[model samples]
Target chain A: KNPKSDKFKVKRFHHIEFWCGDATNVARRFSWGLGMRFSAKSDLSTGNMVHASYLLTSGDLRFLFTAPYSPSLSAGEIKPTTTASIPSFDHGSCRSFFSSHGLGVRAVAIEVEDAESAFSISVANGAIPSSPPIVLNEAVTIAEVKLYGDVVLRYVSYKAEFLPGFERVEDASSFPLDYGIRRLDHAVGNVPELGPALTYVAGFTGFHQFAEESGLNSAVLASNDEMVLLPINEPVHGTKRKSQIQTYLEHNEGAGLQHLALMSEDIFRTLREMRKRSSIGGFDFMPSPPPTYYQNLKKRVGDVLSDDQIKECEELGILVDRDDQGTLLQIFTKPLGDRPTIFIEIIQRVGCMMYQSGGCGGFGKGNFSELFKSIEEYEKTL
Target chain B: KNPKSDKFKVKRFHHIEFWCGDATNVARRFSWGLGMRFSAKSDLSTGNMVHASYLLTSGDLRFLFTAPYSPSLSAGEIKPTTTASIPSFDHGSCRSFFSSHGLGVRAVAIEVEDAESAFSISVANGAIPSSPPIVLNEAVTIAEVKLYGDVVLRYVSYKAEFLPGFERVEDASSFPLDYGIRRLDHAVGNVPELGPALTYVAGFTGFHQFAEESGLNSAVLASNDEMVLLPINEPVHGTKRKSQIQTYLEHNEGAGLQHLALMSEDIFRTLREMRKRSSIGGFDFMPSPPPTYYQNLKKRVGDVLSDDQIKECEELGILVDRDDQGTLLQIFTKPLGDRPTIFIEIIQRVGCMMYQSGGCGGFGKGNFSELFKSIEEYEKTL
Candidate 1:
C-alpha cells in the first residue's frame, strides 16, 4: 500500500477563482451566457474592504471571480508604504499575473478533509507554500500552494455555507438560457514540458498518471474516495506537429489551465442552448466538426443514440467518442478571454459494458485529431 | 460670425469610446443590462489585428468599448520593438491610462466637417496632438487630440457605417429588459481643480459657460447648430462640505468622466424597466428619495404630473425638476466600475410654455439635494 496516497486527501473541487480587472463584467458574462446564477459575494458592501468578489454557481460547480477596489499595482510598482498592522490586500501579485497574461485562471481550490495536512504534505514535497492556513471564523480553513505560472492550488476545508466572509445572495431570477451543465467533470492544465509538472504532482502530491502516449501524457489525481479527479497534460519538448498543449502554452505566454470540462446530464439540451447563446450573445465557440466526423461517429455509436438524439448532437456540432467501457459526448468552446488560452468543454458520459476501466478515463481520444485540426485552423489566423 | 467659434467648428458627439481590460465583458453588461444592442465590432476576426473593439448603440447614441490584444504594457515597459512602417498599436499609453484610472472614457469623438482643420486648430491651441488625421479608405477621416487624464478628443468625418474597419453586426436579439432610453443627453467630466480643465476646453475649443452655481460650476459647450451640448461640472474648492465633483476626484484617484445622462422619451416606462432590471440583474442604481422629498415635490409640481404618475415616479425612485420652459425627469445609476467613477443617468424632457432657454440646459435643481444626500451616503462606504 502506498503510504503517501492516504496522507493528502482532496474531498472535491471547491471552486475556481479568476482574477479579473472587472469582476462584475466577467460575472455577468458567465451568468448570462453560461446559465450560472449569482450565488454570493464578498465586497465593500459585504464587509470585505480589501477586494471585490462575485460568486456564481450552476449545478454543483461554483466560481469566484475577483478584482481589486483600486487599480491593480504591478509587482514592481508595489510601494512599501502601507501600515504593517493593517496589511492591505496586496493586488500586486494579481496585477503582475494579469499583466503577464490576460484573464487566466488564478486559483484552483480543492475541498480537502484537512487543509493543514494537505498544505503540509504538498510543502514537504517540493511545493512552494504560497500562504499558511487561514481560519475564517470557526467554519472554514484555507491554504494555498503555488502551481505552474501564477496559478495557485488552494486547499479549503468545507463549510455549510459556500465560504466564510461571503454573504449569500438570493437571486431568484431565471437565466435567459439553460445549459444543463450538472457538475465539474475535469480540468486540463497545459505545460511546456510534461515530465516536471507530472513528476511534481505525482511525486509531491501522490497523484498518479492514468494515461500516457508518445508526445502527449495525462495524469489523473484523485482523493482517497476517487471523488476529486484532476487530468493534467503537457506537450513533448520536440515534436513534428505542435500539440494542443504547445498551442495553449505559446498563446497563453506561460503554463496555465488549458480548459475545464463541465459535465452535463442532458448534453442535447445543453448543446442546443449553448449554440443559441453563442449566436444571440455574439460569443464565439469552437468551430463545428466536419460532417465526415459525425458520419463516422454515427457509424460507430449509432446503436446507442436514437436517430433524433444523434441528429440533435449533429446540429449542435457535439462530437461523440467511445472506448470499450463507455462513450463520451463532448464539445469545446472558443477561448473565453482575449488570449487563445482558456476555454470550456461540455461533456456527457454514458455507460458502456464492454470496456474495462480503472482510473484511466478517456477524454474522447478519437475526437482529438478532428478538434486539433480546427484549433490549428484558428491558430493559423493568429 | 463669432471669430472665436469660427476658428474651431465642432459638429456633434460622434461617439464615446471606453478603454477596458476586457472589451467583450463590458460590452456584454451594456448589452444585457442596459438594453443596448451590440451593433458592430472591430477585432482579430474583422482584420483589426491590434485591439478588440465592440460598438453598441441605442437610438442615435453610439458607444465604443475597446481593449488591447494582450495585457497592456505600461509606459515604462514599452520598448522600441517594431518598425515605424508597421506602426505597432501603442498598448503602453492605454495601459498607463487604465492603470492610473481604470475603465474610463478614452475618446470623445466629435463629428467634424474637416479632420485636418480640427486637428490643426486644437494642436495650435496648446492641445497635444495624439494622432494625425488619417483617411480610412474613402469612408472616413479621423484625428485625435489629448484631453484631461488620458481622455482624447477625437475628430471624425462621418460615413454610413460605424467605422471603416468595423463590420456591421446584426444582433437581432431582444434584451431581457427594455428601458426607453433614446439618444445620449450629455456627459459630465470631473477635475480636481476646475480652472485649468475648464480653461483648456473653453479657450482651446469653441465652448462657453452657459450656467454656473455657487457650490457647483457648470459650462455648456455646443456645436454651431447648438445640436450637441456638453455640460461640464467641477466642484468648488474650500467648501464646508465636499461637492460631488470633489468626491468623484477623491474616489476615482484623479480626473475623469463623472456620469452620462441618457435621454428617454417615456420616463415612466424606463424607470419601471430599470427597477425590474435591478431586481432581476445584479445592477444597482441610485437609492430612492425620501417620502418627505416626494411630498415636497408634490407640493411644488403637483399640477404638472397626474397623481398616478407621481406615485409611479416615487415608486421607481425617479426625481423630477422643472424650469419655466420645461420639466425634466431624471434618475441616476450607481457607479458602473469598481471605483466610484462612472455612472448613468436616465433623463426625460417635458415641454413647458413659460420657461426660456438657450443652448445650455440645467439638470433639475429641485432634486439635487436629495440626490446629493444619497450619493454622499454611498460615498461613505468607500
Candidate 2:
C-alpha cells in the first residue's frame, strides 16, 4: 500500500516477530490468557492463496500467526481453553520453540514517503541498502538491512510522522491477552568485522557515533556533543559493564548486527500489565535471578540515586551512568528467540545532545583489553 | 604427582587454568592491580622450561599464566594501557619504564595435588588431555591443555573433600611482567550445538532424572539429585541462591566458557575498594550502561514484589523470585579479561541454593523454553 496518502496513516509498530513451535500453544499462553482480540484472517489457498493467517491486537501491537496449507500442516490439536498442549509436552517443546521461532525479532519498518529518497540516502550514507527499496505496491517501497540473519526490517512509506490508526485488523478470534505494541524506539546493528564496516557506515549514513566503547557496559557512553549509546544497562554500564563489550566482540568477532531497540511508554506499567494478563492466561515471564549487586548500592554509586532505584536496575541486569549532559536510562533483554546473535534494546532519551555536548566519555579506555578478552571468550562458545 | 595421599586434605574443586596470550600482560594486570605475590617463573630457553610461566597467589587461589616461546602467544592488553613495549606511565618519576624494565601476559595456571588424576579425568571426560603431568617437585604436577586453540580448562586435582597445604612458587623478577602470573576468578565455557553436548555431559556424568522442570520460580530452585555436583553454602541447603543447574545449562550451549564465579569475602566492600582504586589509578571499570529497566518497576513482574527490591534487580539485570521453597539472589558479571566467554559469578548463600537447600521444588519449570532459547543465543555468539 502507498504509505504516503492520508488513507495510509502509520500505526505504531504492530508485531515485531513471534516465532512458535506451536501456534496453538503460543496462542494459549498469550492470546487466550492475555485478552488480545484477533483482527485479521487470511487464507493463502483457494485460488493462488496458499496459507492461513490470524492477527491479534492488544493496545497498538499486532500478533500475526500464519499456518501454511500443505500436507504436513496441522493446527496444534489444542482446544482454545486448554493451558497445556493437547498432546502433552514433548522434548521438541524446547528445541522446537527455539528453532521454529527464528530470531525473536521483527524490525520496525519505518514508513517513509518515497522509498527512492530513503534508498538514496541509505546507500549514499552507506546504509548497505538491504534491498534497494522493494516496491511492494504503488504506495510503498521498503528499505532495510538483513542485519544479523533473517530478522525482518520492513520499512513502509507514510511520507509523514506516524499516527495511530485503529483500523481493527479482521479476525475470526480474540485472544484473552492484554499485551499491546507500544512505540518504535530505536534499532541496533551488529557489524561483522565492525572496524571496517563501522567506518563504512559512518561514511554512508546518518547513524552517528556517540561513544564507542566495548559491547554492553564496557562500552563508553561518548557523544560528539550529545548523548552516548551505553550498550547494555544498569550495573553493566560505565566501568563494571566492560565484560559485555568484550563479550560482543568475542561472540560476534568481526562486526555484525547485535540487536534492535523498542520503547514502551511505560515499560514498568506495561510489564506489570503483561504479568497480570500472563498469570490469568498461563503465559509466564522468563525466570531471572535476584541481584546481589544491589546490596552495596550506596557505596558503589554513592548517595545520589536511591537504594530502591539501584535495586531495580540490578534485578534486570541493567546499568546506569550519566554526565553533565543528562541521565540516560536503558536496559537490554536476553536475546529473544534464538541465534543469540540478535536481541532487543528498550531506551528512553531524556536530555538531548545540546545538554550533553561531548557528553559520552570513558569507552575503550580501561575496558578495551577486558572487552577484547571477553569477546575472545564469547567467540569460543560458537 | 599422585593424588592418593591419605594425609592430604582436598576440597571440592581441583585447580583453575589460564590460557595466556602475552603472559607478561596477564602478570601486570594481576600483580600490579590485585595484591598477588608471584612465586614461580619458567621459560623454555632458561634451562628445562618449554614455555614461559609465572605463578601467583591470593588467599586460596593459586594463579599461573603460560605462553610458548614463539611469538604466537596471546596477551591481554586492557585499554588505556599503551601498547608501548616499554613502561610509558611514570611512577615515582621512573622514566623509560619498559626500556628500563618491560611489559606482557604469558599464561595463567592453578596448583593441584594430583595433576595426573586431574589430567586423566579431564581426558576421560572428553577434554583432549595435554601432555603427561609435568612434576615440578614431589609435591606438584602441572598438566596443561594444548595451546593449538584458545586457552582453556587445564588439569586440576582435588581429592575427597579436603584441600592440602601449598608449595611455595618461584621468584618474580626472573619471570617478569611479560611472564608474570595472574590470580584466578571464574572461567566460562561454550559449546556449539548445545543439544547433543548437554545430553553428552549428562550421560558422561551419569546424571539421571535431572531435576527437570519448566520454570525456576514456580517450580523453583535446583535439584542436587542431578549429575553436576555443586557445593551448597554453609547453613541452609536449598534456601537462598539455589542450584548450579541453571548456571550449567546456560553455559553448555557450545560456547567458550561463560564466566567463572570468583571467590571474594565482603563483595560489597571489595567493589567499593575497586571503585576507589579505579579513581586513584585512573583505572576504568570494564564497561556497562545504566540500569533503566526497573524504571517501570510495577509493569513487568507486578506489585507482588516491593518497588525497592525491583529497582535493585533492574539496576543489575539480576532476577529475583521466591516461593515457599526459598528465596535466592544472584547476578552474572560481564566476562572477565578480554574474552566474552569467560566471566564470573559471585554468589553468596543466605538460605538460598548457594546457601539454602531445603526448598528444592525441582529444576526451573515452564521457563525451560526461555532458558534454552537464551542459551541457544549465547552459544551462537561463540
Candidate 3:
C-alpha cells in the first residue's frame, strides 16, 4: 500500500444504485423483502422524466432504484421537458445495460472524504474515468470510474436529503419495524481473474488486503479505518463443474457486483422477522450447507451459539463461524433478479464494535466453503 | 355475428402469460401485491432451459410469467439441452418483447373446444397466424394468432395439470388466503385507431360490440357464450390536452394490451386484504376520483351501495356504478410496472351470474368519465 494515501480517505458506503427493468415494483420488492424503508422519490412529477427513481433507506443503507422511460422520452431520442434545476441523464446506456444484463447492480456508491480529490487522484492513478466530478446542487457531488465490466464505482459526497432532485416519501406500512440491518458490511464484486482486480483496486485506492480464501475467494480490501470492505472473487478454473463466479459473469455478460452483505445486529430476529413477513413476500434463501456440516458445528466453532441458536441456524440455513476474536453469522438470498447474477447477504458480528475489519469477527474465511457449497448446490437448478 | 361459429366455439380465458424481465421476482410480486397464488412452475430444473416460468392462480386466474435467460443460453445463440418431451421456444422474441415493452402481457390464452379448428377458422377468416396448432401431450394443444401490437391470442385446449412441463408449487406463506379475485372479466388493448382493431377482432371471432365510450372507446366484444369480453381502446383526438390512451401508445412504443380487469367476488375484502399484506408490499392506486363524485355517489347509484359502503368507497377510492341488472364496484391500480402501460383492475359484480355479458352491470358507462378524469389529470405529470 502507498504511504502517500494519508490525505486520501473513504468514510463509508453512501449508497448503492440499481438500474432495473421496473424500478417502482423492484423498489417495493426491496422494501418488503429486506425491510428497506421507502424514503424518497423522483419521477415525471418531479421533472426527472428520464427514469422513475426511488430512494430506500435503513440506517446507513441507502439504495437508489432507477428504471429508464420509453426510448421516446429517454435515450435522448426526443429531448424532454424538465424543471430548470432537474438534470436529465442519457438513458441510452440504461437501455443497453438492461438488455445485456437484466436488473443488475450498476453502481456501488462510496462515501469519500473529498469527492473532487477522489476523482482527481483515481484518474491520475490510472483508473478509467466514467464521468468527471458532477455537482448536483450545493450539498451533493459525485463522480464515477469504471469498476470492472459495466459496473461503476461512484464517488459521492452527500450531506443532504437523499440527493437534490428527490422528494421525501415515508414508509407507512406495518411489518418488521426493525430489519436489524445496521449498514453494509461489504460489497463484493466478481472478476474473471482476482489478482489483477485486487492489484487495480489496491493501486488506485491505497488499501490493504485483509483476507484470502479458496480460489473462489473472500479476499477483502479495506480503507485505513476499515469502515468499508471490498471483496473481489475469481472462480476456480478446474472445478468439477462451473464455478458460481464464472456462471455469474456469463449470465451478467461481464464482471460486476456479485452480492451485498448487509450487517445486522440480531441476525436471528432479522431472519425470523423477514421470513415472518409475507405481503409482497420475503426473499428465497440459498439451500443450506450440507446436513453433515451442522453435525460438527459445535466441535468447530465450540458452542459460540447455543443449542437453540444452532437449531435456529439449521432451520433458517444460516452459517456460523469465528476467528479467535469472536463469531460471525451469515445467510444469503438466492439471486435477486432473473439473471443468476446479483443477490444479498445478511451478516452479523458478535462481541465487537462497528467498522472494525477484524476486531469482533473477521471475514468468514472458515465459512467460504460452506457458502460456496450452498450456492454450488443451488446453481444446479440454473 | 356469424351463426356458423357453432363448429368453432371458444370457452373463456385460460391464462394470461407475461413476458417480463424477471419472472421469478415478478411472480412473487404478483403473489403478494394482487394475491395471485403461487401455483406451479417450469424452469431449468424442469429442463426448460430458455426461460424461467411461474404459473400463479386464483380461482380461474392463471398467470404465467416467463423471463428469458441471457443471450448465451437464450436467443438461440447456443443450443440448450432439454427433456425429450419438452419443446423449446425461441427466446429471441422474448428479449425483444421485454426491450420494446418492459413487463407486458405477451399472450391472452383462450380456451376453445378444439385448438386445431380455432386456428384453422381464424386463419381462414384472415387472422394472421403466428403459430400452427401444436400438441404438447395427450391432453393439451395450443395455437397462436397475432393480436394487435406484439400481443398474441393463444388458442388452447387444456384439460389438465397447469401445463405439461410445470410442477405444483403451493403458496405456503401466511397472508390473505382469499384475494376474492374470481376470474378475468375482460382483457383490454390499446390501439392507434379503434375501428380497425374492432373490425379485425370481429371478423375473425364472430363477436359483437357490447359498449362504446366517448372518443376514447371501451367498445367490448363478447363471444357468443359471453365467456370472454375484449375491449379495444383508442384515444380521442383534439382534446384540450393529450389523452391517456395516446400517452399509453407512445410509452408502450406501439399499440398493445393496456390493462387487465380481474373480476373479484368481494372487492371490499380483496382491496382491504391486499392493503393489509405487507411482507413484499402492496400496489399503489391511481389518485382517487374527485371529491364531488364520491359525495354524489349515493344520489347517482341511489342506495345500490350501503351508506357505510359509500363512505368506504370514498375512503378506499372504489368506484360505484349500476345498470338495471345489478351494481358493479371497481377500482383500478396505478400502472403496474415502470412504464405507464399495463395495470390491473379489481371488479365486483353484484347479483349477476358469471359468463353473461351485461346480465350483471353493463360496462361502467357512467364511471368512464370519472376514471378518465382521474387518469387525464394523472397523465399531466408525464
Task: Write one digit per residue (lDDT tens) for candidate 2, span B184-267.
Answer: 332333333434444433322222322323212211111132211221111112544543334333322122343444444434
Using DockQ, rank the candidates from best to worst.
3, 1, 2
Candidate 1 vs 2: which has more lDDT:
1
Sort the predicted structures by TM-score, highest score first. Answer: 3, 1, 2
Best by the lDDT measure: 3
Give the range where candidate 1 chain A is weakest over 10 consecutive residues by summed lDDT. A79-88
- Report per-candidate DockQ: 0.30, 0.01, 0.48
On residues B1-382, what C-alpha lDDT tens digit does candidate 3 reach at each position?
3243433788888999998877866777777888777777777667665678887788898888887766565544343344322243456787778778878899999999888889899889978988788787688888898889999989989755877878776445324445788788889999998999988888887777663345586587877766688888899988777788988998899999998989887888888877665333677676677666776777777557778888888887788878877787888888888888898888887765554454267667778776676556556635
lDDT of 1 by residue, B265-362 (tens): 68788767666665334357786876656666677678788878888888988888876556778888887876667888888877733432332235
DockQ of 1: 0.30
Second chain alone, TM-score for each candidate: 0.84, 0.50, 0.88
List the candidates ranked by lDDT, beginning with the highest. 3, 1, 2
The TM-score between candidate 1 and the true structure equals 0.85
Q: Judged by lDDT against the true structure, how good is candidate 2?
A: 0.36
What share of the reference contacts survives in each candidate? 0.21, 0.00, 0.63
What range of 10 consecutive residues in model 1 chain B has the weakest lDDT sum?
Answer: B79-88
What DockQ was computed for model 3? 0.48
